[PDB]
């Protein structure tokens, strides 16, 4: 009858009370996110109501056992995350209010939309409609108005509920005694009570400036060289030392430079790495796509995908009848049910994000086993790591002449290395300072660094700081150009995906050493590598059960993050840029802009 | 006698139990062909225990059990000789040298609605194990800590009987299986089950 033993015992009581109800809940949001209509939003509402107040009675509970007196720090984990009070703070009407002010924004980003000047009854949503103008159009007014009419038609929708969005998230991350909800989320990185290996929230920040230091001439390189390149691409519009205008960048935001490999390929002489022609030549469909991805998994010992997944998973676009959140979301809904949602085209982009989030399915089923509290992934970064492990691998020329998207006459030489190099400098290179500056952004809002008064203000002087991105059109203060993203709109932290691809490289290298690839590591394509894929699997089957800095070490060899293996990937091109680059400038000045004043 | 054995009325049932207050029923003067359980090739586990299922055709014995329940599909792996875990230490314990068969098969068509079904039970917290074939149905509060429970769950008093929770969507091993455990057994007394 000792502490430790009637915690065990609660745990377990609570691990099985736990796990329908949450599955409730995981059930009625996909019914939402599948189908958004009034009805199920309130069945969302009210399965998430309910599964909230479970945690509030059992938080009482939780708190009422010593915490100090509990041995293993594996079960000191699970009662210390049961004790935390979480939105239970927040007033009856405070707490209503925040949910309502979240689902606002989850609606209207998946479902605004805005109509054509020329004709008002064709509108246009933002998957497919505008995400596709932003990611094949070559007119710049084109660009232009989608860019600027989806900030302004939606994003002024979007800022006076973020202004109250900041207040509430504060005043309940205040009460959980971090110092803004910016700390809290960074809290998930934080690692206590392990001599050695400990982690404060404070130093994810001195990490991800260190890191991005090293980062800074590779990018500007590259700025240097694309900007070289729009400047033929957009003939007037561009200037040889300003930033880059951002609606000319590839998407929506410029989150992925990559959609510009047409304009800024090297060689284009040689084939098409982007085998999105190949694709729609050989008639993929979304299903040969999928097919294709868990068929690589099963390459290194991974399981197939239940039959669940292929039953209850939305693939495509539901149509117009049904309006659904089209961004790519994979689902863990426990009890043992895998689905993943998104509306898949027939893109290398889209079979590339296949490999990505199914990634983060294996890594949900691997550590199906632990107990509830520890089903999770090390920390964000990791869970956000594993799909890109295997784009790394997919993406490569060998693994394309594989599955037969590239000629099987096609081989490679060294204009083919640089032209893949390329590409993936668009993808992964290139979002690097886009991520940490928007997170940066949030933090110094979240902390109340930048005052209500100069939101919009602060956020441009920071794109063509950081990001070397300017405006092509002047946004006071009605607009909320952050929440025009997925990430900030729905709620999800952001700086997952600079770690990830930091820990990407470190777990490549790892990996092309465990199928003893010999050669650079951007040839890598663990496939047929059992000794690859047990190695990564039994990191993943101990889910949150140690602590990231621990696993980390386990598989790389590495307390923290490092970005020596993401330098060393890119080396080839950083000094093929750097030979291209020696009559262009390279940086830029934060003064010249698009227009006028 | 040359009376077949009522298999169909047990592994056809409508309904079957809960595996806390598992379900036996006794088969007397009877003609059990065990070879036709085998050859309808239904199940997914089939497994027999200190006896040949070839030998177990042509062999007497004074009366045959079936007992019946229904569990998760990963929990399947507990209705075996000298196992662990929340089913054989609370709810159906087999003894570790054991002669009988284990049977199951995948009932989620059946016993999986829509929403959920709950009518299933499993007996969470116990003050001992089961000693074999030991069953409990006891609906005392489980108490966990020096202060009693007055009859009400609470601050570590906990309600020994939970729910299953199936629905079709589940995962396999969170799906339900139906499981048919066959005893034999011999006593001083006239043999009323025998094979062809
Ligand atoms: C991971 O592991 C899988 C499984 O081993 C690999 O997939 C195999 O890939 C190889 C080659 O890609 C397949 O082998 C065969 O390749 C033939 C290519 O022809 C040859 O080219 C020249 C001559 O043209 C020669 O040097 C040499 O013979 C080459 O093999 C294909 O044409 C064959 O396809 C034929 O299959 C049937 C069988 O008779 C014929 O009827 C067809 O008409 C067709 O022509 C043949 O398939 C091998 O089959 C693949 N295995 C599987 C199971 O699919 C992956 O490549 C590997 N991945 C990595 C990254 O290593
Ligand atoms: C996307 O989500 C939307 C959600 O809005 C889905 O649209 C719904 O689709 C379902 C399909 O199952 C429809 O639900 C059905 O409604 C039937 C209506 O029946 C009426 O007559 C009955 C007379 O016997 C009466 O019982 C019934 O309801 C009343 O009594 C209930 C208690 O008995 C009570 O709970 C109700 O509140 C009400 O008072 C109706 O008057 C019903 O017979 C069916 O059993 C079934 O429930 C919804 O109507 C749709 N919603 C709409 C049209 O707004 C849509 O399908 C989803 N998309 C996809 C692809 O699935
Ligand atoms: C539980 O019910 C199922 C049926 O729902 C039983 O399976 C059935 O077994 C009988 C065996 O006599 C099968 O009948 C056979 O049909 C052929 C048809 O050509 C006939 O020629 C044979 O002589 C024989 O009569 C029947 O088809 C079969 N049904 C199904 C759907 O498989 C099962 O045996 C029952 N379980 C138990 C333990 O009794
Ligand atoms: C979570 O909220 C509860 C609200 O009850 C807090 O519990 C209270 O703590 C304060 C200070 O310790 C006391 O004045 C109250 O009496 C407590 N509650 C009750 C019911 O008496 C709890 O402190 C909060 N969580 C944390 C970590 O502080
Ligand atoms: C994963 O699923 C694939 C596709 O269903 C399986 O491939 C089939 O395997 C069976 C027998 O193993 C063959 O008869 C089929 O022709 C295969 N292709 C199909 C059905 O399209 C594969 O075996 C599965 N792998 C694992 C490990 O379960
Ligand atoms: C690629 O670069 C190597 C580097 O040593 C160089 O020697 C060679 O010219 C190139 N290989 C080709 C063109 O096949
Ligand atoms: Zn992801």
Same mark, same amino acid.
């Given at each position: 009858?000792?502490?430790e033993?009637?915690?065990?015992?609660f745990?377990?009581?609570?691990?099985?009370k736990?796990?329908?109800?949450?599955?409730?809940?995981?059930?009625? $949001?996909?019914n939402?996110?599948?189908?958004?209509? &009034?009805?199920?939003v309130?069945?969302?509402?009210?399965?998430?109501?309910?599964?909230?107040?479970?945690?509030?009675?059992?938080?009482?509970?939780?708190?009422?056992?010593?915490?100090?007196?509990?041995?293993?720090?594996?079960?000191?984990? +699970?009662?210390?995350?049961? +004790?935390?009070?979480?939105?239970?703070?927040?007033?009856?009407?405070?707490?209503?209010?925040?949910?309502?002010?979240?689902?606002?924004?989850?609606t209207?980003? !998946?479902?605004?939309?805005?109509?054509?000047?020329?004709?008002?009854?064709?509108?246009?949503?933002?998957?497919?409609?505008?995400?596709?103008? %932003?990611?094949?159009?070559?007119?710049?007014?084109?660009?232009?108005?989608?860019?600027?009419?989806?900030?302004s038609?939606?994003?002024?929708?979007?800022?006076?509920?973020?202004?109250?969005?900041?207040?509430?998230?504060?005043?309940?991350?205040?009460?959980?005694?971090?110092?803004?909800?910016?700390?809290?989320?960074?809290?998930?990185?934080?690692?206590?009570?392990?001599?050695?290996?400990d982690?404060?929230?404070?130093?994810?920040?001195?990490?991800?400036?260190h890191?991005?230091?090293?980062?800074?001439?590779?990018?500007?390189?590259?700025?240097?060289?694309?900007?070289?390149?729009? %400047?033929?691409?957009?003939?007037?519009?561009? $200037?040889?030392?300003?930033?880059?205008?951002?609606?000319?960048?590839?998407?929506?935001?410029?989150?992925?430079?990559?959609?510009?490999?047409?304009?800024?390929?090297?060689?284009?002489?040689?084939?098409?790495?982007?085998?999105?022609?190949?694709?729609?030549?050989?008639?993929?469909?979304?299903?040969?796509? #999928?097919? &294709?991805?868990?068929?690589?998994?099963? !390459?290194?010992?991974?399981?197939?995908?239940?039959?669940g997944?292929?039953?209850? $998973?939305?693939?495509?676009?539901?149509?117009?009848?049904?309006?659904?959140?089209?961004?790519?979301?994979?689902?863990?809904?426990?009890?043992?049910?895998?689905?993943?949602?998104?509306?898949?085209?027939?893109?290398?982009?889209d079979?590339?994000?296949?490999?990505?989030? %199914?990634?983060?399915?294996?890594?949900?089923?691997?550590?199906?086993?632990?107990?509830?509290?520890?089903?999770?992934?090390?920390?964000?970064?990791?869970?956000?790591?594993?799909?890109?492990?295997?784009?790394?691998?997919?993406?490569?020329?060998?693994?394309?002449?594989?599955?037969?998207?590239?000629?099987?006459?096609?081989?490679?030489?060294?204009?083919t290395?640089?032209? #893949?190099?390329?590409?993936?400098?668009?993808?992964?290179?290139?979002?690097?300072?886009f991520?940490?500056?928007?997170?940066?952004?949030?933090?110094?809002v979240?902390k109340?660094?930048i005052?209500?008064?100069?939101? %919009?203000?602060?956020?441009?002087?920071?794109?063509?700081?950081?990001?070397?991105?300017?405006?092509?059109?002047?946004?006071?203060?009605?607009?909320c150009?952050p929440?025009?993203?997925?990430?900030?709109?729905?709620?999800?932290?952001?700086?997952?995906?600079?770690?990830?691809?930091?820990? +990407?490289? +470190?777990?490549?290298?790892?990996?092309?050493?465990?199928?003893?690839?010999?050669?650079?590591?951007?040839?890598?394509?663990?496939?047929?590598?059992?000794?690859?894929?047990?190695?990564?699997?039994?990191?993943?089957?101990?889910?949150?059960?140690?602590?990231?800095?621990?696993?980390?070490?386990?598989?790389?060899?590495?307390?923290?993050?490092?970005?020596?293996?993401?330098?060393?990937?890119?080396?080839?091109?950083?000094t093929?840029?750097?030979?291209?680059?020696?009559? $262009?400038?390279?940086?830029?000045?934060?003064?010249? !802009?698009?227009?006028?004043? | 006698?040359?009376?077949?054995?009522?298999?169909?009325?047990?592994?056809?049932?409508?309904?079957?139990?809960?595996?806390?207050?598992?379900?036996?029923?006794?088969?007397?003067?009877?003609?059990?062909?065990?070879?036709?359980?085998?050859?309808?090739?239904?199940?997914?586990?089939?497994?027999?225990?200190?006896?040949?299922?070839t030998?177990l055709?042509?062999?007497?014995?004074t009366?045959?059990?079936?007992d019946?329940?229904?569990?998760?599909?990963?929990?399947?792996?507990?209705?075996?000789?000298?196992?662990?875990?929340?089913?054989?230490?609370?709810?159906?314990?087999?003894?570790?040298?054991?002669?009988?068969?284990?049977?199951?098969?995948?009932?989620?068509?059946?016993?999986?609605?829509?929403?959920?079904?709950?009518?299933?039970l499993?007996?969470?917290?116990?003050?001992?194990?089961?000693?074999?074939? /030991?069953?409990?149905?006891?609906? /005392?509060?489980?108490?966990?800590?020096?202060?009693?429970?007055?009859?009400? /769950?609470?601050?570590?008093?906990?309600?020994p009987?939970?729910?299953?929770?199936?629905?079709?969507?589940?995962?396999?091993?969170?799906?339900?299986?139906?499981?048919?455990?066959?005893?034999?057994?011999?006593?001083h007394?006239?043999?009323?089950?025998?094979?062809?």
């Amino acid at each position: 009858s000792t502490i430790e033993e009637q915690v065990e015992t609660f745990l377990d009581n609570f691990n099985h009370k736990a796990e329908d109800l949450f599955y409730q809940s995981s059930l009625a $949001s996909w019914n939402y996110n599948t189908n958004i209509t &009034e009805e199920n939003v309130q069945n969302m509402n009210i399965a998430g109501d309910k599964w909230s107040a479970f945690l509030k009675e059992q938080s009482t509970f939780a708190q009422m056992y010593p915490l100090q007196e509990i041995q293993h720090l594996t079960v000191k984990l +699970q009662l210390q995350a049961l +004790q935390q009070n979480g939105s239970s703070v927040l007033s009856e009407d405070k707490s209503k209010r925040l949910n309502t002010i979240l689902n606002t924004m989850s609606t209207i980003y !998946s479902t605004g939309k805005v109509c054509n000047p020329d004709n008002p009854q064709e509108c246009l949503l933002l998957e497919p409609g505008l995400n596709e103008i %932003m990611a094949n159009s070559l007119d710049y007014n084109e660009r232009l108005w989608a860019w600027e009419s989806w900030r302004s038609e939606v994003g002024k929708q979007l800022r006076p509920l973020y202004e109250e969005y900041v207040v509430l998230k504060n005043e309940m991350a205040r009460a959980n005694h971090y110092e803004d909800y910016g700390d809290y989320w960074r809290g998930d990185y934080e690692v206590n009570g392990v001599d050695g290996y400990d982690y404060s929230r404070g130093q994810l920040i001195e990490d991800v400036e260190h890191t991005f230091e090293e980062i800074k001439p590779l990018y500007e390189h590259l700025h240097a060289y694309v900007r070289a390149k729009l %400047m033929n691409a957009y003939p007037s519009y561009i $200037s040889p030392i300003g930033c880059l205008p951002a609606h000319l960048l590839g998407d929506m935001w410029g989150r992925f430079w990559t959609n510009l490999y047409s304009l800024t390929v090297p060689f284009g002489q040689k084939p098409n790495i982007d085998v999105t022609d190949a694709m729609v030549d050989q008639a993929w469909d979304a299903q040969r796509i #999928f097919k &294709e991805a868990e068929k690589f998994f099963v !390459s290194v010992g991974l399981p197939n995908m239940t039959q669940g997944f292929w039953e209850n $998973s939305m693939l495509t676009d539901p149509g117009n009848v049904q309006k659904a959140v089209c961004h790519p979301t994979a689902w863990d809904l426990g009890k043992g049910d895998f689905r993943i949602l998104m509306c898949t085209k027939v893109t290398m982009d889209d079979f590339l994000t296949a490999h990505h989030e %199914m990634g983060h399915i294996q890594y949900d089923m691997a550590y199906a086993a632990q107990p509830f509290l520890l089903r999770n992934g090390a920390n964000e970064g990791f869970h956000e790591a594993v799909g890109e492990i295997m784009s790394l691998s997919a993406a490569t020329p060998k693994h394309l002449k594989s599955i037969g998207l590239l000629s099987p006459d096609f081989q490679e030489d060294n204009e083919t290395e640089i032209n #893949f190099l390329l590409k993936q400098a668009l993808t992964i290179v290139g979002t690097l300072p886009f991520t940490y500056m928007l997170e940066k952004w949030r933090w110094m809002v979240f902390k109340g660094e930048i005052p209500k008064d100069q939101w %919009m203000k602060k956020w441009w002087e920071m794109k063509r700081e950081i990001v070397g991105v300017v405006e092509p059109v002047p946004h006071d203060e009605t607009y909320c150009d952050p929440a025009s993203l997925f990430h900030v709109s729905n709620d999800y932290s952001f700086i997952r995906y600079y770690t990830r691809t930091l820990y +990407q490289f +470190q777990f490549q290298e790892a990996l092309c050493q465990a199928a003893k690839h010999e050669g650079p590591l951007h040839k890598c394509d663990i496939s047929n590598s059992t000794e690859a894929g047990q190695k990564l699997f039994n990191m993943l089957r101990l889910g949150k059960s140690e602590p990231w800095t621990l696993a980390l070490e386990n598989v790389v060899g590495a307390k923290n993050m490092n970005v020596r293996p993401l330098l060393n990937y890119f080396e080839p091109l950083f000094t093929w840029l750097k030979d291209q680059n020696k009559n $262009s400038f390279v940086g830029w000045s934060t003064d010249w !802009s698009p227009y006028a004043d | 006698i040359t009376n077949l054995c009522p298999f169909g009325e047990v592994f056809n049932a409508t309904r079957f139990a809960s595996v806390y207050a598992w379900n036996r029923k006794r088969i007397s003067n009877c003609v059990a062909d065990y070879s036709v359980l085998y050859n309808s090739a239904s199940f997914s586990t089939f497994k027999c225990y200190g006896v040949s299922p070839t030998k177990l055709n042509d062999l007497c014995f004074t009366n045959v059990y079936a007992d019946s329940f229904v569990i998760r599909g990963d929990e399947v792996r507990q209705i075996a000789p000298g196992q662990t875990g929340k089913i054989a230490d609370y709810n159906y314990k087999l003894p570790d040298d054991f002669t009988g068969c284990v049977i199951a098969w995948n009932s989620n068509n059946l016993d999986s609605k829509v929403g959920g079904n709950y009518n299933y039970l499993y007996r969470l917290f116990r003050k001992s194990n089961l000693k074999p074939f /030991e069953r409990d149905i006891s609906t /005392e509060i489980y108490q966990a800590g020096s202060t009693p429970c007055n009859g009400v /769950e609470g601050f570590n008093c906990y309600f020994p009987l939970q729910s299953y929770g199936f629905q079709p969507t589940n995962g396999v091993g969170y799906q339900p299986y139906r499981v048919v455990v066959l005893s034999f057994e011999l006593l001083h007394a006239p043999a009323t089950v025998c094979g062809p």
